[PDB]
A paper describes a structure:
Nitrilotriacetate monooxygenase (NTA-Mo) is an oxidoreductase and a member of the family of two-component monooxygenases which initiates the oxidation of NTA under aerobic conditions. The amino-acid alignment and the three-dimensional structure motif of NTA-MoB from M. thermoresistibile (MthNTA-MoB) associate it with a family of short-chain flavin reductases.
Here, we report the 1.6 Å resolution crystal structure of MthNTA-MoB, a homolog of Rv3567c from M. tuberculosis (Mtu) in a highly conserved family within Mycobacterium. MthNTA-MoB consists of 11 β-strands and five α-helices, with seven antiparallel β-sheet core regions forming a split-barrel motif capped by an α-helix. Consistent with observations from size-exclusion chromatography, the biological molecule observed within the crystal lattice is a dimer and the crystal structure contained two noncrystallographically related dimers. PISA calculated a total buried surface area of 8610 Å2 and a change in solvent free energy of −234 kJ mol−1 upon dimerization. The spatial difference between Cα atoms of MthNTA-MoB and BtPheA2 is 0.98 Å, indicating a high degree of structural conservation for two proteins with only 32% sequence similarity. In the MthNTA-MoB structure the loop region has the highest deviation from the structure of substrate-bound BtPheA2. This region adopts the same conformation in all four protomers in the asymmetric unit and is flexible and adjacent to the NADH-binding cleft. The density was sufficient to allow modelling of the long loop at the C-terminus, a region that is often absent in structures obtained using crystallo­graphic data owing to a high degree of flexibility, and may provide additional insight into its role in modulating activity via access for cofactor binding.
Author numbering:
A (entry chain A): 3 to 181
B (entry chain B): 1 to 182
The structure:
Amino acid sequence: AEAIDQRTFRRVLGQFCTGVTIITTVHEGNPVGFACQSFAALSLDPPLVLFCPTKVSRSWKAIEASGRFCVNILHEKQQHVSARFGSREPDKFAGIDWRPSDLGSPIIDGSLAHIDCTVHDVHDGGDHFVVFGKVHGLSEVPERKPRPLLFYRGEYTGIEPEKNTPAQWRDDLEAFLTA
Amino acid sequence: VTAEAIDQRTFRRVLGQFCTGVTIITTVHEGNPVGFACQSFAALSLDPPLVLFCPTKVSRSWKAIEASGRFCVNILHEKQQHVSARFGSREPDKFAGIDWRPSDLGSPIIDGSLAHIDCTVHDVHDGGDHFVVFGKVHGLSEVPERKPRPLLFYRGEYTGIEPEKNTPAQWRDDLEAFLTAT
């Protein structure tokens, strides 16, 4: 009954659709990363983001040690990259083109956007941590078609661009960070 | 030394490249239903079962949620763009013309939503010009069943999925698996 309760959490929370990130660092010379969907924009002033690694994550411990990370937001053509980071295969950056950011963290070629960060604060979050990052630089790749990789009810998907609709807002007290 | 190095227009443009669902987060306070639209939501923990959301420090709804001690998260269907629009307006009664009923804890469920999650306030942290609020999950539901077509927000616009793109996914590394992985 414990395992069924956990299956229900996974299914119901899966109804909230998200993009997909790879969060990366370099620790003593080698590139390190993990796939993550528990990402959000947090604050404009100061500029902050958050992400939620598991308490058992090996990749987060490398980020904690360096104090630096880059967030790569994935394009739908990068489904293979996400699958690679999700596996137990060694040498995860093999065959994947990348370059260091201004702070030294891996930027993956072909992404929609990247965000160059330092670790700002860390909190306990049950069986996960919540990590705040301070933003030091960011950009989107020009002329790449805006088609994000999605994750919804346990499967990869993408958008139908014919559905794109302008949004108007008036309540300034509750403004989205991205409007 | 106080540093200002990030342009605000650039922040909004770049962070909009991360696509999200759309929620309405609700409570009852001083005999009235209260709610707001929010994209800063995430699944947080399995054991214990937790979620998080991030209201602005100036939020009217957060003051009501803080006082009552409880909230319900409603995940919207693509045909509910009109609900998100009303909650994003300055109308004095936002629940007018929108069908709703109380959850087991006593917070508004929006009829026609894809799913809802019934919570109590668990902890609260400072997050710059926002707060980060943790909720303890007491109930959750994805019925009555509706065709699985979520309302999305991407690059400052509403959108939706192409269901022909839906593809199964496998995850061998248990130490890093998503909370919602099958």
